[PDB]
Design a binder for these strands. Structure first.
Ligand SMILES: Nc1ncnc2c1ncn2[C@@H]1O[C@H](COP(=O)(O)OP(=O)(O)OP(O)(O)=S)[C@@H](O)[C@H]1O
Lengths: 260, 273, 247, 439
DNA sequence: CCCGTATATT
DNA sequence: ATATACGGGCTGCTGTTGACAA
């Protein structure tokens, strides 16, 4: 039975998974501290999540860690099978069991007397990169809100091919540039605003990024309340989000991308 | 052939608007059967057959007609009728009358009132095609055979949501009805298998009480259908009635009975996906 | 050229841009000695819409004529005119710098090609007939019509009343016979059967812009074949629309 | 010094055009008879203009329209940054046909007659080819001003023109036809001489005028196309160029293969058949079959069918016919599979062509072609209709006596059945197969 | 490819 | 006496990957 997990609010896990859903497959990691689902694409972009043991009520694991690969679309569809619009006062409960290697994943859901049973067979594993972004070589870091860039990143889907990010202590403190068919489009963000919680950039940094790799950050930006931007000496970009649930807990999602 | 009808009451007009919207969402072209007593919405063909029965005396205050065999059959597009009725939500008077201005038409005239003393008049001419009597037998109400199992239906919203989420995985569904009020929806793919259960559904008292001593209560007469016509039928409905019944037979037929306010709905979905 | 728009005028400017986009495919920008002129013409040159903006923001021309693809402007002002200030200039590029809340600044550089001066010829004085009414009444009068209609006919019935119909050229479609009363209109110089036939989409854009502050229209229709005129007057905003009539 | 010579020496007046006078006169009389006899009740009409590229179809129409004061309406495809392309096209067509321009500011004002010219057809019209028929039918029903269609076509690879107008809409819609021809050598010669004289008179510096001997070479390798000729003249006058590819006009390639232009065996060192192959001696050949077949832009299995249809009439002996038939059969055998059908296909066509060419010993003796080769037209293979009839009769035999073998075994029984039965549409089928002509 | 015919022009 | 155009014959008979209009 290796790992069994039970919960009464599927929405937390469902929204955490939906915040990272742009590929088709995902890899899990069950450890005494909790699960960790990661995904990679183009051997450059990598997105990971974290669901600590504090959220869970009935969590049981056996011996060492457990790894398996699961289709994300099917799991996300199965989780939200009772409608993604519940009125206040209605909840859904789920139970999941994984009985070791070579056997599928169970999922029993219940709500108001209706009981559903589903199974997802897993064919694992893959290999993941080693994107180590420890806070030792980080040179430029910023922390900022989300409602500022809701429309900004919404006003970012054009027929361009490269997004230019420049950050400097003076003049264009945080400028995004997009070169398309019509013309340039600058979106300068200054300091000392309502969305400037800490500015600590050291030296000027201008870099180019691919639109195709960096596009799926909209889903993480929409379901968030704060965003942290980090870039090191070489020019690798690290994005840290902060999502909350109905109960009042906090979960994190991280994105790693490499420059052109 | 003559037909004239008058609608004044607001609630009746709103109910007529709801019925027209429902039939427009359910089907494209429909048949209207007008009788001295009642109205019938017919569709016959994917072999889904659609019957809707409506009492005339509870909606119109003035209603006159003339067709020996006093019975009017009309074939028309439902979208035109729905668009015509949409503009009379806040109206005052509505008149429906058969006319032959240029081609056979079902004139709908609506009197709009406003702050102005003058009353606006909006007129629409929906074309009609009178079906000859030779086909009158082919539009009759479908017969209901003896059901293998008759079961009360659950809440429509939850079933609709579950079916809608089930549409993505596959295009095949299996419905199972038990004798203890258990309804099972099953899909089985080469990668994922899903089954949803319903219990505590009151079994209505069956007419035949002498054919239950050798029939297992745990036995079932499940059937399999293509999930492309069930979803329309659940999506069209907007209010949950109090006469939700399902009759299931073993071989090739599933049948739905609904009744809300004073309108009855009979649903027939062929099996063998 | 230098224009600095401040206040709620941004919304009405965006609405005018949307109406022009609903009418035409290209946008002609002309700085006159008395303000700014936005012009647009249909592909077949059967309709012409012009907005003249009385000096209201900072107007100062010369330190002088351009045309631009209209979808770009439409997208920019659909996604960026919901915003407290606007600045327009001509570098050399067309700068559409847009000040926003707090300190966010958005700039839009665009490409333009040289074009000729576009104008038309209308004679409102020469038109015998004349009709005036608030825009809300006309907008309500065109609501029952389906959104797939092409041509509409305006006429004056027997008994001093107006009538709007549906012109159709054996699977026919629905017809409409909407009629009104004389007590809603404010001015009618008409005749005993004079009617005109024109299009609908440009009329719908006109009504859409005219249904904001409850403005009053003015139609000067003439004998069939001659163009019709739709003139909208406001405090600091003038607009004229010219259509064509079936002969 | 800012436009090419193509755009600098455009014909302003009618007399500066490089088209034969009769064609200009024909277009002019059509247009002017429409204008002069413009009845108030006259409906719409469609004119079709064809021709190889670079002959001058558009310019002559524009010049003739400007001479007689006619408004013209163009159609430029709209530029994307929901409505279908066909919807926009029909809306533009209705607006252009119904109403007129307003006043503009400086035009050719005194106008009430106009025509609509459509050249840049949308892609969806090429893919579908069935929306166009409905659009044309509606226009014929509701048309006022004529519609002129301009198409560019080549000798081989004419799929788009026949796909767009497949001989049925023209027949049932009353569409006229006007076809251009490539410019004659003398006209292009005189115009090129005029242009080079104008350049020479410019002076400015000591520039080498292009030699006359290359000037006919430039016009020889262009195949009656003015624009490439002017471009090549501009390129060469800087101090042959312009080798446009040929299409060979498949019916000409068939004649080239089947006529076997031979030489008189000029003294060379070609290998000879030593002792016993004395009946296989042939005169020198001046054609490469592979290039001819490749340049016609046709599949090999179709070229072989056409050769099989048309090769009998040109032969005079029976033994040569036997050899040619054996060669054709062997060419057929090599393409009978499905996985390797496209890996080896050049072998079959090459074998068939060379066998048909070499087997004709009666024709292949140099000065032995006098006299014959009368005015004879070629034809089309008859195998297509027979195969389609075989397939439809296959289905009509199966599904209706389904309880190929039925046609091979049961259908003999049907042929010896001849007795009536209970149906109406089946007696006709019974009488169909079983009533072949026989004395 | 193939043969014979009607018009512009020197 | 020599250059140029009419006349008559063609759209046609299992698998794996890729672009277009909605
Ligand atoms: N005497 C001439 N006759 C014709 N065109 C000329 C002549 N002198 C110069 N030109 C140039 O050649 C161009 C002719 O363009 P073309 O491509 O031959 O027309 P076209 O018939 O549209 O060809 P398509 O469309 O590709 S089949 C004119 O627009 C001029 O720029």
């Amino acid at each position: 039975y290796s790992l069994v997990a039970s919960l009464d609010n599927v929405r937390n896990l469902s929204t955490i998974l939906k915040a990272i859903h742009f590929r088709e497959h995902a890899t899990c990691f069950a450890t005494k501290n909790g699960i960790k689902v990661t995904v990679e694409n183009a051997k450059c972009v990598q997105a990971n999540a974290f669901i600590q043991a504090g959220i869970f009520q009935e969590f049981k694991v056996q011996e060492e860690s457990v790894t398996f690969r699961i289709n994300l679309t099917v799991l996300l569809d199965c989780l939200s099978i009772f409608g993604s619009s519940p009125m206040p006062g209605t909840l859904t409960a789920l139970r999941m069991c994984y009985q070791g290697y070579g056997y599928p994943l169970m999922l029993f859901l219940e709500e108001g007397g209706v009981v559903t049973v589903c199974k997802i067979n897993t064919q694992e594993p893959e290999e993941t990169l080693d994107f180590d972004f420890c806070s030792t070589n980080v040179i430029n870091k910023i922390i900022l809100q989300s409602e500022g860039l809701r429309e900004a990143f919404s006003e970012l889907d054009m027929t361009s091919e490269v997004l230019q990010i420049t950050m400097s202590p003076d003049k264009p403190y945080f400028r995004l540039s997009t070169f398309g068919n019509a013309g340039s489009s600058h979106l300068d963000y200054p300091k000392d605003s309502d969305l400037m919680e800490a500015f600590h950039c050291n030296q000027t940094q201008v870099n180019r990024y691919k639109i195709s790799l960096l596009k799926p950050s909209t889903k993480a930006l929409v379901l968030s309340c704060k965003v942290s931007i980090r870039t090191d000496n070489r020019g690798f970009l690290s994005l840290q989000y902060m999502i909350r649930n109905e109960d009042g807990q906090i979960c994190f999602v991280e994105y790693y991308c490499c420059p052109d | 052939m003559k037909f004239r009808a008058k609608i004044v009451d607001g609630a009746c007009l709103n109910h007529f608007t709801r019925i027209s919207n429902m039939i427009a969402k359910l089907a494209k072209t429909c048949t209207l059967r007008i009788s001295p007593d009642k109205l019938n919405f017919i569709l016959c063909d994917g072999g889904v057959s659609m019957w809707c029965e409506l009492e005339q005396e509870n909606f119109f205050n003035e209603f006159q007609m003339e067709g020996e065999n006093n019975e009017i059959y009309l074939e028309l597009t439902s979208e035109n009728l729905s668009r015509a009725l949409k503009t009379a939500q806040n109206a005052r008077a509505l008149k429906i009358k058969l006319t032959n201005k240029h081609f056979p038409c079902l004139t709908v005239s609506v009197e709009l009132l406003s702050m102005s003393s003058s009353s606006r008049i909006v007129t629409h001419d929906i074309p009609i095609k009178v079906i000859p009597r030779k086909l009158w037998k082919d539009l009759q109400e479908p017969v209901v055979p003896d059901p293998d199992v008759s079961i009360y239906l659950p809440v429509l919203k939850t079933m609709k949501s579950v079916v809608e989420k089930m549409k993505n995985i596959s295009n095949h569904l299996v419905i199972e009805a038990n004798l203890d009020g258990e309804l099972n929806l099953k899909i089985e793919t080469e990668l994922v298998c899903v089954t949803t259960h319903f219990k505590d559904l009151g079994n209505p008292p069956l007419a035949s009480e002498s054919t239950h001593e050798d029939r297992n209560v745990e036995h079932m007469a499940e059937v399999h259908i293509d999930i492309r016509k069930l979803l329309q039928f659940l999506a069209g409905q907007q209010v949950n009635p109090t006469k939700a019944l399902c009759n299931i037979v073993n071989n090739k037929m599933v049948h739905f009975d609904l009744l809300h306010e004073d309108v009855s709905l009979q649903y027939f979905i062929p099996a063998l996906s | 050229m230098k224009c600095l728009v401040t206040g709620g005028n941004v919304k009405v400017l965006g609405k005018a841009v949307h109406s022009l986009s609903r009418i035409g495919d290209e946008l002609y920008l002309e700085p006159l000695e008395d303000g700014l002129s936005l012009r647009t013409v249909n592909s077949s040159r059967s309709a012409y819409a012009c907005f003249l903006f009385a000096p209201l923001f900072f107007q100062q021309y010369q330190a002088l004529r351009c045309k631009i693809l209209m979808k770009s402007f439409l997208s920019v002002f659909r996604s960026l005119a919901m915003v407290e200030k606007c600045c327009i200039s001509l570098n050399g590029r067309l700068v559409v710098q847009l000040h926003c809340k707090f300190g966010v600044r958005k700039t839009h550089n665009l490409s333009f090609q040289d074009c000729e001066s576009l104008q038309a010829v209308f004679d409102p004085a020469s038109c015998p007939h004349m009709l005036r009414a608030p825009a809300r009444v006309l907008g309500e009068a065109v609501l029952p019509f389906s959104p797939a209609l092409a041509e509409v006919t305006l006429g004056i019935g027997r008994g001093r009343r107006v009538i709007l119909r549906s012109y159709h050229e054996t699977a026919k479609a629905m017809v409409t016979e909407m009629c009104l009363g004389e007590e809603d209109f404010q001015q009618l110089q008409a005749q005993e059967g004079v009617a005109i036939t024109f299009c609908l989409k440009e009329f719908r854009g006109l009504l859409s812009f005219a249904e904001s502050a409850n403005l009053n229209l003015s139609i000067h229709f003439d004998a069939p074949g001659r163009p019709a005129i739709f003139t909208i007057k406001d405090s600091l905003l003038d607009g004229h629309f010219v259509l064509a009539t079936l002969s | 010094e800012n436009e090419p010579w193509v755009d600098k020496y455009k014909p302003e007046t009618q007399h500066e055009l490089a088209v034969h006078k009769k064609k200009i006169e024909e277009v002019e009389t059509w247009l002017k008879a429409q204008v002069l006899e413009r009845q108030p009740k006259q409906g719409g009409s469609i004119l079709l203009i064809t021709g190889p590229p670079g002959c001058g179809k558009t310019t002559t129409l524009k010049i003739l329209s400007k001479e007689h004061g006619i408004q013209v309406q163009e159609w430029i495809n709209p530029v994307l940054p929901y409505q279908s392309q066909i919807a926009v096209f029909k809306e533009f067509l209705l607006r252009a046909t119904k109403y007129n321009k307003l006043q503009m500011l400086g035009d050719d004002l005194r106008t009430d007659k106009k025509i609509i010219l459509v050249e840049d057809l949308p892609n969806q019209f090429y893919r579908d080819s069935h929306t166009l028929h409905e659009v044309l039918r509606k226009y014929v029903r509701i048309g006022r001003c004529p519609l002129i269609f301009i198409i560019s076509d080549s000798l081989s690879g004419d799929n788009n023109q026949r796909l767009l107008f497949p001989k049925e809409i023209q027949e049932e819609c009353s569409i006229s036809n006007i076809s251009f021809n490539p410019v004659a050598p003398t006209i292009m010669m005189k115009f090129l001489n005029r242009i080079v004289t104008i350049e020479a008179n410019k002076n400015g510096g000591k520039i080498t005028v292009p030699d006359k001997t290359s000037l006919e070479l430039l016009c020889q390798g262009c195949s009656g196309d003015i624009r490439s000729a002017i471009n090549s003249l501009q390129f060469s006058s800087s101090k042959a160029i312009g080798g446009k590819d040929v299409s060979l006009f498949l019916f000409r390639a068939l004649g080239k293969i089947l006529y076997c232009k031979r030489a008189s065996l000029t003294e060379l060192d070609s290998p000879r058949l030593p002792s016993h192959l004395s009946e296989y001696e042939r005169d020198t050949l001046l054609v490469e079959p592979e290039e001819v077949v490749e340049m016609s832009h046709m599949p090999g299995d179709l070229f072989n069918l056409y050769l099989h249809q048309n090769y009998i009439d040109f032969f005079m002996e029976i033994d040569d016919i036997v050899r040619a038939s054996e060669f054709l059969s062997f060419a057929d055998i090599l393409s009978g599979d499905w996985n390797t059908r496209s890996l080896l296909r050049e072998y079959s066509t090459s074998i068939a062509t060379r066998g048909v060419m070499h087997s004709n010993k009666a024709r292949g003796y140099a000065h032995c072609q006098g006299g014959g080769s009368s005015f004879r037209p070629l034809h089309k293979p008859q195998w297509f209709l027979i195969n389609k009839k075989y397939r439809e009769n296959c289905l009509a035999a199966k599904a209706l006596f389904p309880d190929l073998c039925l046609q091979t075994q049961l259908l003999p029984y049907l042929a010896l059945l001849t007795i009536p039965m209970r149906n109406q549409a089946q007696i006709s089928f019974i009488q169909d197969i079983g009533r072949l002509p026989l004395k």
